[PDB]
Every structure is written in structure tokens, then in C-alpha cells.
Design a protein around this ligand. Structure first.
Ligand SMILES: Nc1nc2[nH]cnc2c(=O)[nH]1
Ligand SMILES: Nc1nc2[nH]cnc2c(=O)[nH]1
Ligand SMILES: Nc1nc2[nH]cnc2c(=O)[nH]1
Lengths: 283, 283, 282
């Protein structure tokens, strides 16, 4: 897909057009549509402005990067993403992450919506990602497929420690501060390609494999971030409880997902800000 | 792959060249090679005649759509299909289904051959598909991958109710009429890409995941049908019992599959006809 | 990808440029032994020389086929392979296997490195592959995908008997001779695409599915070999034990893998030679 130069050009373009120098990249999933509003000294770039950036044909906008400070933390926020189910190859899906690395970002925060597989979870819960199961990865759909560039990382990176232990500990503490009724969940996120929702039998399979939440994103980004050495922290908003029996007349649907994203908007906004304080300083 | 126009053209061609107006599409799998013979007022179209239709290089024929009445039921029958293992992309495999929708069909009946994973199953059994596990789908091989057309259906369709409850109830009753020794089985169908047959370890994996039968087709069609609102009903002829241990010297083989398809031909022909009576009338 | 001609040309080129006529092809695992040194009457071909052969951009060399005798057994050895994770399509990954068949080879020995999923395995163990779980295969990534050529094999080949039971029984049988403290393991190999290593959750998934060892190669080759009638035998050097819990601070890494491949080099070299004696005659 892209050459090392391509990534470098894209980073140079951004670096030369802003004085912001982000430590943390945040990929906004459902419910963080409005997180930019909490940025101070915001500066926007549209994907159409940025060289080599792929573009969503999705009607509203191409999407944007927004630099700024979140609780005095120097960050870049990514709004609008690319998904495997939309037809994008994985090197396009994960293009931004390699760019962030070249911006000198050292921490990636990924968020998403997911269906709850774990019976304890409730719509509205936040689940810290402790680990993932990369089903597309097993079959070949891994973003690192192809020639490896030692300037980014190793030919065979490890994923057993992908989700930073310390940030999860600190996240667990600091969540008490918000004084929420439901606690912070923690669990395994499984990635499926989508875009259709799971059958009952499929949900049962995912449960047996050990997954607590299922979604259609995030994992490829995590793998690329880890490949180039970034610290990674992630979580899912449980937006619906996956159907697990044939009796129910309920069905997963996207409007439900958006509604859940709205209810949780503030909780999520609050939580990401707080979390900024927990992030270690550069080096 | 195709544009909305393409589908529309193909449907218009067919609609303008026949007065038949099918309610039910039937995709014939093994053992239904001769089901066209029970059609009254038959009218054939070869795939070579039909605009935008993909074509099998398989030597005998391109294959054909045959309109007609089966037990006075207005239907179109599809003979010869396209498979993922043959190299076809999924939007080609499932092209006919979208066309059937545009013909005003509202019920899809899919049939196939499958290996028996459930120890209770016997060669010759018919298994009603209650649900499926779409393994290729997990990895990205989903026919709906790419831009969604809202003229067909939603961006994120649900599959939890894919196989019509009522049809299955009615099918279970009406099977008594044939007075068969072995009863109607019901279970989960798993799709694997093929074309090689499962190892023992793989068979055990598919059993653990909860599958009763394994095949190499059908699921992409079902997903597309449901996406555009069709009622779906399906079943598998158990043509062989998958090897489950290292002692056996038996091996799956395609001649065995064809033989089973032949033994069952009449039972199957009978069953599909009967079933026509059970189908609801056009809403 | 390739036509039947292409395969034939490549075979004709090789046949016409050597008098060696191998019975056994051996694919030396990426991470494993430089066993060519034990070949007598060696004759090398570089991949660059051979028509239609794909080529590794990997800096050191394209890689080579080396004909010869190993314990008086007429064989061809393949050093350097192609992997799905490198971007190669499967028909390129398995191209050599089809060519071996056309050379008149009738037995394929495949070896590789693998991470240990079964708690009983120890770094250094050899695991005979009794069976495999082809995960990419389930999703479409099967090397036989596309039109079938009946000149090679059936449209729907069976894999339930892929790994020759006699060769395994003999291997385990004569292993006594390998006067090792530790014995010959036997198990299920699972293929995953790679190139990144498994998480803990994935490890547990693969364990539940019944796999004993996990790797990123071999299976496509085996599928192609069996499609054209070859006898297949295969084994894995357990080069590391896959991380199974969140507490550990160990991580899989490729240097560990190369180290283990080094410690085991002689044990492996010895074992393959011995095995030559066990192979049936044409
Ligand atoms: N695959 C999948 N993704 C989701 N994202 C939000 N809910 C769901 C779900 O139920 N399934
Ligand atoms: N994968 C698969 N497909 C089939 N079609 C008919 N029998 C079988 C079988 O045993 N396995
Ligand atoms: N996937 C995989 N392949 C390997 N080859 C050697 N070790 C490993 C491992 O731990 N995982």
C-alpha cells in the first residue's frame, strides 16, 4: 500500500502546519462525538486537507484530526474512522496510527462500541479492554501483513502485553472519583469483520472462546500501535446485550447503539479527561 | 462489484421476457438436480442469456433459471451455483439473490449437502437449518462488505432470526405426511470455505463450537436474502458423516456425496413440493 | 496464478539440469537446521535461476533448492520459504510442492518452529504433527481455491489422513535410538496467519480448540502435497511456550526462537537422517 516516505510526508505536513506536539492520540468511538468540545487551543485538519489520508464517502464529512490540550495534556483526536466492513484494506484502516507515531505520540487511547457477551454486563457499562481476540487476524487479515519495515518495528511483534497494565490499574482507581453506580468492567474484546450482527449460535461461540465484548474495530489499530512501540489503553461502551437465545424477539440494531452512545456521552467525556492525569510523562 | 442499475437491468430483462411472477426462489443443492421436472409451465433461461450473470466454466453447462409452478406455487428455481472455493467473490456468489428480490420474490429456499457432525445424524437425513455459524464472515468474507445500499437494506442487518420460525414449525408437522422412518433433524449449519475436507481436529473444533452440519455454501446467500427482507428457509442433506477419529480408514469423498444425493433425490423432491403448501401468501 | 505449463516448465528445467531424481522433498523450517551439509553429491540451484519461482526480497539470499542424497536417500531440500504473512498468495507459497510432484517426488517432509500450547511440552521438544487445524482455510485462505486441475488431484480432496500414520508409528518407534532424556511428542498443529504473536486470550482459544502447537506455516503445503497424492510427514520444534497468563513478564520474540533452533540443530539433523531409513521405497 504505502511507502515509508508516504507516512513521513503526511507527518511532515502536519508537523509543519501546527505547533501542537501531541503525546497522546485518541481514537473516538461511539459516544465521543463531542469530546473535541473539551479540547483547549483546538486546531482542526480535515482528512481532505491531509496528504495520503484515505477518505470516507460517508456523506456528512470526510472526518478530521483535532489537536489541542485535554486537561492540559497535549493530544491529537481522531474523529471518523475507517473499517474493514466498509471495504478499506487494513493498511488504510491503520494508516493514521503510523502517522501518530511519526508525530511523536507515545500513547494511543482507542474506544469503541461493543455488544455485551458477558451476562454481568449492562447497557451503558464501560469495559476496559484487558486483551483481545483477533479473529480476522487468524485468517490473514492482519494489518502487518506484507514486507516489514524495521523503521517501524519487528517482523514478529508480541501482543501478550498489548493493553498497558499500569494504565488499567490507574484507570480502575480513578473511576471511583466519578461516583458511578455501575463499576468499571474489565474484559476480553473480540473483533469480527461485520457488518451484519451475530446470530445466536455465533454469540455462543464467542462466549465459549472467552470474549466479554464483541465489535468490528480497534484491534488492527492496537496491533499497529504495539508494533511501533506505543503504549495502548482501550475501552468499549457496552451499547447492547447480544441476543443469546432463540425465544427473544429483540434484535441488535444501530439506533439502539446510537442511543446508548448518547446516554453515555458525558460519562465517557468525563472519564477520558480524568484518565489524562493518569498518563505517564514522555520518557 | 455491481451497481444498483446492474441488478435492476438483470431483473427488467427477466421480467420483460416472462409472464411468470415468482413468490419463492429455490436454490437447488445436491439431490435436487431433477426438481425442475416437477415444475409445470416451465420456462428456462440460461445464465449465458442473462445480462450481468456470472458464468460457470464447469464444462457441462453455465446453468439455468427455471420459472414455473411447483404445487401451484409461483417460483423460480436456480440450478448451478457459484462457490467461494471456485474463486468467485461473494458479491458474485450472491448476485442472484438480489435479483430474486427485484423480481418480487419474498421467500428463499436454500438447500445443500453437508457433512454430519452431530453423532445422531445418519447419511440420508435432512437437517432443517435452525441457525448458522459463518466462519468466513468472522474474517471479512461477508457478502455485504463494502458500501451499503439503503435500497436493499440496512448497513447492519441482524441475523439472529434468519431462519423462519414458522416455516420450521410447519415443516416439522408436514414431514410426518411422507411417513419416513428417520425423522426430520434440526440444527446448526457451519460454513467453511473449502474446497478440501476437514481434518479430524477440525471436525472436533466444529463440534465444540456447536455445529451439527458443515458445508461450503448457503450462508452468504442467506445473509443477502435477510439483508433485503426475504423470508428464508433452508436445509441440508447429510451426505456423509465427518471422520471424528484417527483409527478410521474411511475418508470423505465427492462420489459418496453424489451417491447420497441420488438415494435421497425422491425424498427431497417430495419434501420440497409438500413444503410449498406451508408457505404464507404475499403480504 | 500459474498455468499447468508453468509448473511443467519449471520441472523440465530442473530435470534437464541435473541427473538427481529425488524421492523425498524436505522443507526446512524457517527458524531451523542447515541440514544441506549432510547431503552427499550436493547440487545447488538458486531461486533466481529457476523459472517461475517466486523470490524472497529478504536481503541475504533468494534461497535455494539443493539436490543430493541423505543417508543414501535421493532427495531435494528446500531452504528458504514463502509465508502468508509476507504477502505471498497461497499459490505462490505452495508452488514448489506442485513442482516436487512433477519431479517424481512421492514423499514430503515439512518442518517448522511452533509455540507450545500443550502444558506438557518443553522448549526443545520435537512434536510429530498428527493433524492440523487450518484456521485461514476456514475463511477462504486455502491454496486450492480457484479452478481445480484434475491433472493434479480432485476438486474436493480429503485431509483426514494427511499425516502418514505408518511414518509416525515408525518415527515414534525408532526414537529409542535418539537416546534422549525427553521423548517424541505427537499432537495437533494449528496454523494462524501471523505475523504478530498470540495474545493470552488467543492462546487460550487455541488450547480450547485442541491444538498442541501453533505456527504460521506448513499447512498450505501439506494441503497441496495431499491434493496431488504425496505422502506427508511433518514435525515442529517447540521453540517457546506460548504465554498463558496475565502475570508473566515473558514475551514471545524471534531471538528466543532462533536460539532454540540452534540448541536443537544437531538433534534435528540426526533425527531427519534416521528418518530417511524409515521411508518406503517407490
Ligand atoms: N459485532 C457487533 N458489534 C457491535 N457494536 C455494538 N454492538 C455490537 C454487536 O452486537 N455486535
Ligand atoms: N466441508 C464439507 N462439506 C461437505 N459437503 C458434503 N459433505 C461435506 C463435508 O463432509 N465437509
Ligand atoms: N504463531 C506462532 N508461531 C510461532 N513459531 C514459533 N513460535 C511461535 C508462536 O509462539 N506463535
Amino acid at each position: 500500500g504505502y511507502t515509508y516516505e508516504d507516512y513521513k510526508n503526511t507527518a511532515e505536513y502536519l508537523l509543519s502546519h501546527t505547533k501542537h506536539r501531541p503525546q497522546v492520540a485518541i481514537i473516538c468511538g461511539s459516544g465521543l462525538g463531542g469530546l473535541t468540545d473539551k479540547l483547549t487551543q483546538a486546531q482542526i485538519f480535515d482528512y481532505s486537507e491531509i496528504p495520503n489520508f484515505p477518505r470516507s464517502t460517508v456523506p456528512g464529512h470526510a472526518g478530521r484530526l483535532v489537536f489541542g490540550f485535554l486537561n492540559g495534556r497535549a493530544c491529537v483526536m481522531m474523529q471518523g474512522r475507517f473499517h474493514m466492513y466498509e471495504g478499506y484494506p487494513l493498511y488504510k484502516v491503520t494508516f493514521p496510527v503510523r502517522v501518530f507515531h511519526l508525530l511523536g505520540v507515545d500513547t494511543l487511547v482507542v474506544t469503541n462500541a461493543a455488544g455485551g457477551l458477558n451476562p454481568k454486563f449492562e447497557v451503558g457499562d464501560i469495559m476496559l479492554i484487558r486483551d483481545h481476540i483477533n479473529l480476522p487476524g487468524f485468517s490473514g487479515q492482519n494489518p502487518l501483513r506484507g514486507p516489514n519495515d524495521e523503521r517501524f518495528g519487528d517482523r514478529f511483534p508480541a501482543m501478550s502485553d498489548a493493553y498497558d497494565r499500569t494504565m488499567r490499574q490507574r484507570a480502575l482507581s480513578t473511576y471511583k472519583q466519578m461516583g458511578e453506580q455501575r463499576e468499571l468492567q474489565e474484559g476480553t474484546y473480540v473483533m469480527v469483520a461485520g457488518p451484519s450482527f451475530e446470530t445466536v449460535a455465533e454469540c455462543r461461540v464467542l462466549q465459549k472462546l472467552g470474549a466479554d465484548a464483541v465489535g468490528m474495530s480497534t484491534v488492527p489499530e492496537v496491533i499497529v500501535a504495539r508494533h511501533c512501540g506505543l503504549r495502548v489503553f482501550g475501552f468499549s461502551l457496552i451499547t447492547n446485550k447480544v441476543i443469546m437465545d432463540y425465544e427473544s424477539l429483540e434484535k441488535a440494531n444501530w439506533e439502539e447503539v446510537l442511543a446508548a452512545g448518547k446516554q453515555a456521552a458525558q460519562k465517557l467525556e468525563q472519564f477520558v479527561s480524568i484518565l489524562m492525569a493518569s498518563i505517564p510523562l514522555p520518557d
